[PDB]
Design goal:
This is part of a larger assembly, with 3 copies of chain A.
Chain A lengths: L15 H17 L5 H27 L3 H5 L2 H7 L5 H13 L2 H16 L6 H10 L4 H14 L7 H10 L12 E6 L8 H4 L3 E5 L7 E2 L2 E2 L7 E5 L5 E8 L1 H11 L7 H20 L8 E6 L9 H13 L1
Parallel strand pairs in A: 1-6, 1-7
Antiparallel strand pairs in A: 2-5, 3-4, 5-6
Helix pairs in contact in A: 2-4, 2-5, 2-6, 8-12, 11-12
GO molecular function (chain A): 2',3'-cyclic GMP-AMP binding; cyclic-di-GMP binding; protein homodimerization activity; proton channel activity
Subcellular location (chain A): Endoplasmic reticulum membrane; Cytoplasm, Perinuclear region; Endoplasmic reticulum-Golgi intermediate compartment membrane; Golgi apparatus membrane
Catalytic activity (chain A): H(+)(in) = H(+)(out)
Chain lengths: 320, 49, 49
């Protein structure tokens, strides 16, 4: 049959709902054996249980007031904090209030005490289901893969490459405090193959030929980085070492595929999360202590033909 | 809640590795394999078998 | 066959050379030809293995 043996954990069949339904049918059958005013108590208890999510949503919006400007920019905040299935909760609360406030006070006290104590948490089953059900969370994986594959192998060997480059032409020997690789991470996904064409003030200075060789999936090390020259105003010229983020190209290719079904807003969110994850991963590293500077920009609404060059020149000025 | 769950888990690396491996390598090297092997199969009867 | 372990050289007294020796005669067929690249660095040719 098979020399090895594999037990692949196929996803849940979702039969918990069926068990709940059959238990509910059993409960109805039991209630049939062996009344009307008890419906009022049932409705009041349902309203008491429902006001808990209302309290949670109010607390969540109170905490999200500060993140309103950063994420939602007033209706969006309350829409996100409150689950959409909340109109029936308001109807139940109104019906309970009309039918009757000590009971309401004790019910809300118990609900918010449970919420504040935090004794109701998620077991392993539901967190595992959430982990394995969200198919599109490539931000952290892409960040870790990029860092390990590329940023942990070429960044330490950056002083010597530029040392031989300066041996070829001593022009960049004058600038010693900007001997670090610059990374451009646009929050969209556009990538220019010819960076000299992205802005008119970026021109090549040195690009020696190099072949990238992979033997049975093992990629060979890169021993050369493309040196550029960004033209300043009519005062001087400055060199740089520039790169783009391959994971952003990965997001672009993911969005191009039809089977992926990967949209634009999700792409923006994943790009921002990848940027944050890569920044946090590089911040707490040791080998890449100061041999990098990553530049994140969002393309402006107004058409500017020299936006990127000004941004990188500003980054160089603060670099000095 | 779902946003916090997505943000908090910093170890969900499997999906990222799968998609990265696919797009970077398999989508670009797999299709050009039969044509790359048929030329050797022309001269080597063992591969043709 | 151990007594025929030597390289055979064909030198026609004319100058015709067949690139596909399998086509020169119908009874000559390949048995093994693994790919190999001939590399010369600044005029220095690499050995043939």
């Amino acid at each position: 049959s098979s020399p090895a043996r594999l037990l692949i954990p196929e996803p849940r069949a979702g039969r918990a709902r069926h068990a709940a339904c059959v238990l509910l049918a059993v409960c109805f059958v039991v209630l049939f054996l062996s009344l009307a005013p008890i419906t009022r108590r049932v409705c009041t208890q349902l309203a008491a249980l429902q006001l808990g999510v209302l309290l949670k949503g109010c607390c969540c919006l109170a905490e999200e007031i500060f993140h309103l400007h950063s994420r939602h920019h007033l209706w969006q905040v309350l829409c996100s904090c409150f689950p959409p299935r909340w109109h029936l909760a308001l109807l139940l609360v109104g019906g309970s209030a009309y039918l009757d406030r000590l009971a309401l006070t004790l019910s809300c006290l118990c609900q918010l005490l449970v919420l504040a104590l935090g004794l109701q948490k998620l077991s392993a089953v539901e967190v595992s289901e959430l982990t394995e059900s969200s198919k599109k969370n490539v931000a952290h994986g892409l960040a870790w893969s990029y860092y390990i594959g590329y940023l942990k192998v070429v960044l330490p060997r950056l002083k010597e490459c530029m040392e031989e480059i300066s041996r070829t032409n001593p022009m960049l020997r004058a600038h010693r405090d900007t001997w670090k690789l610059h990374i451009l991470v646009p929050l969209g996904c556009d990538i220019w193959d010819d960076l000299e064409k992205a802005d008119s003030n970026i021109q090549y200075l040195a690009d020696l030929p190099e072949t990238i060789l992979t033997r049975a999936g093992i990629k060979r090390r890169v021993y050369k980085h493309s040196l550029y020259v960004i033209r300043d105003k009519d005062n001087k010229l400055r060199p740089c070492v520039l790169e783009f983020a391959s994971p952003l190209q990965t997001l672009c290719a993911m969005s191009q595929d039809d089977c992926a079904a990967f949209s634009r807003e999700q792409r923006l969110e994943q790009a921002r999360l990848f940027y944050r994850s890569l920044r946090d991963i590089l911040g707490s590293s040791k080998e890449c202590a100061g041999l990098y500077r990553l530049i994140a920009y969002e393309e402006p609404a107004e058409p500017e033909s020299h936006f990127l060059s000004g941004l990188i020149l500003w980054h160089l000025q603060q670099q000095q």
